[PDB]
Amino acid sequence: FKDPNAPKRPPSAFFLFCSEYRPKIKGEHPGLSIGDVAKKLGEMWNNTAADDKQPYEKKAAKLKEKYEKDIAAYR
Amino acid sequence: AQNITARIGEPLVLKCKGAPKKPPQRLEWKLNTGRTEAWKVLSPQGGGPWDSVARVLPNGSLFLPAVGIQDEGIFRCQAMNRNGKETKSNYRVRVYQIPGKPEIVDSASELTAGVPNKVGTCVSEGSYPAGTLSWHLDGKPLVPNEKGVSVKEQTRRHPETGLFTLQSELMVTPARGGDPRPTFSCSFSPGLPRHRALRTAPIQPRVWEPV
C-alpha cells in the first residue's frame, strides 16, 4: 500500500456500519448475522427519545482509501 | 435544512432553474447561502471507492447537513443547471427544537430612588447584540431631577440563556419623592426552545430615613 517512506493506503473498516445493533457474537449470543452489519446503517440515533432520532451516515474504508485524512500517515 | 438545525444535503441557488433545497452544496450553481466551497450536488457521504471523501450520487441520496455563507444564494443563475435569473438568498440559523422548562437568574427588588441603582433584572435574549437599559426602581411615576438614578449593570447578567436584557423607561429626570414608586417597565421574552425563561424587576437606588 506503500512507498519507501511514503504513503500507506489507510486502514479502516467501513463494512461494519451497525456498531451496536449487529455485533452480538459475544455474550449470551452465538448468533447474529454477517448481513446485520452492512445494510442497516441507521443504528445509533434510533436509540434516543423523540427529538432527533434519525441519522447515521459516514464511514471509512481501507484499500486505497483514505485520501483525505491519513494517507499522509505514511506520506 | 435551510432554517432549522436539521437535515441534509440538496443543491440550490435561489429561484432559478436547477435548485433543490437542503444545504449544503458542492459544484457550480452559484453563490451566497451556505457552508461548503461550491454550489451544487453535494456529498462527503462516505463509503465506496471515495470513502475517503464521499459517495456522490445520481439518484439523489447525497449528504451534508446545514447552512452558512457562500453556497445557494444571490446569483444571476447561469451556473449550469440551465436557468437563469438574478435570484437571491442568504441564511444562517440558530438553535430551536422541542421546548420546555423555566430558566431563572437576575432577581433583586427594592431600593426606591435617588442614588446609584444596583440590580435590575428584566429578561430576554436574541439579537445581534442584545440591548439596553434604564434607571427605575419599581412603581408608579418617578420624581424629576434629583441626585441621579442610575445604571442596571450590577444586575445578575447572563446574555444567552434568555434572562437579562433591556428595561427602557425614562427616569432621565431622577427622584427623591418617597415610596417605592419611581419608574418600572421591563417585561419581555423567554429563553430557549428546549427550556425557556421568565421575567423579573426594575433597577434600584435607595431612599432612606436618617431622621
Curated annotation (Swiss-Prot), chain A:
Induction: (Microbial infection) Protein levels increase upon infection by human coronavirus SARS-CoV-2.
Protein's cellular compartments: Nucleus; Chromosome; Cytoplasm; Secreted
Biological process according to GO: activation of innate immune response; apoptotic cell clearance; autophagy; base-excision repair; cellular response to interleukin-7; cellular response to lipopolysaccharide; dendritic cell chemotaxis; DNA geometric change
Superkingdom of source: Eukaryota
Tissues showing expression: Ubiquitous. Expressed in platelets.
Something else known: Proposed to contribute to the pathogenesis of various chronic inflammatory and autoimmune diseases, and cancer. High serum levels are found in several inflammatory events including sepsis, rheumatoid arthritis, artherosclerosis chronic kidney disease, systemic lupus erythematosus (SLE). Seems to be implicated in other diseases characterized by cell death and damage, including diabetes and Alzheimer's disease. Its nucleosome-associated release during secondary necrosis may play a role in SLE.
Subunit composition and interactions: Interacts (fully reduced HMGB1) with CXCL12; probably in a 1:2 ratio involving two molecules of CXCL12, each interacting with one HMG box of HMGB1; inhibited by glycyrrhizin. Associates with the TLR4:LY96 receptor complex. Component of the RAG complex composed of core components RAG1 and RAG2, and associated component HMGB1 or HMGB2. Interacts (in cytoplasm upon starvation) with BECN1; inhibits the interaction of BECN1 and BCL2 leading to promotion of autophagy. Interacts with KPNA1; involved in nuclear import. Interacts with SREBF1, TLR2, TLR4, TLR9, PTPRZ1, APEX1, FEN1, POLB, TERT. (Microbial infection) Interacts with adenovirus protein pVII; this interaction immobilizes HMGB1 on chromatin, thus preventing its release from cell and subsequent inflammation activation.
Protein name: High mobility group protein B1
UniProt organism field: Homo sapiens
Species classification: Eukaryota, Metazoa, Chordata, Craniata, Vertebrata
Residues of the full protein shown: 89 to 163 of 215
UniProtKB/Swiss-Prot annotation, chain B:
Sequence ranges assigned to domain Ig-like V-type in this UniProt record: 1-94
Disulfide-bond pairs as recorded: 16-77, 122-186
Keywords carried by this UniProt record: Cell membrane, Cell projection, Disulfide bond, DNA damage, DNA repair, DNA replication, DNA-binding, Endosome, Glycoprotein, Immunoglobulin domain, Inflammatory response, Membrane, Nucleus, Phagocytosis, Phosphoprotein, Receptor, Repeat, RNA-binding, Secreted, Signal, Transmembrane, Transmembrane helix, Ubl conjugation
Post-translational modification: Phosphorylated on its cytoplasmic domain by PKCzeta/PRKCZ upon ligand binding. Phosphorylated by ATM following DNA damage.
Biological processes, Gene Ontology terms: astrocyte activation; cell surface receptor signaling pathway; cellular response to amyloid-beta; glucose mediated signaling pathway; induction of positive chemotaxis; inflammatory response; learning or memory; microglial cell activation
Chain ranges of the Ig-like C2-type domain: 102-199
One cellular-component annotation, GO: postsynapse
Glycosylation sites: 3, 59
Protein name, entry field: Advanced glycosylation end product-specific receptor
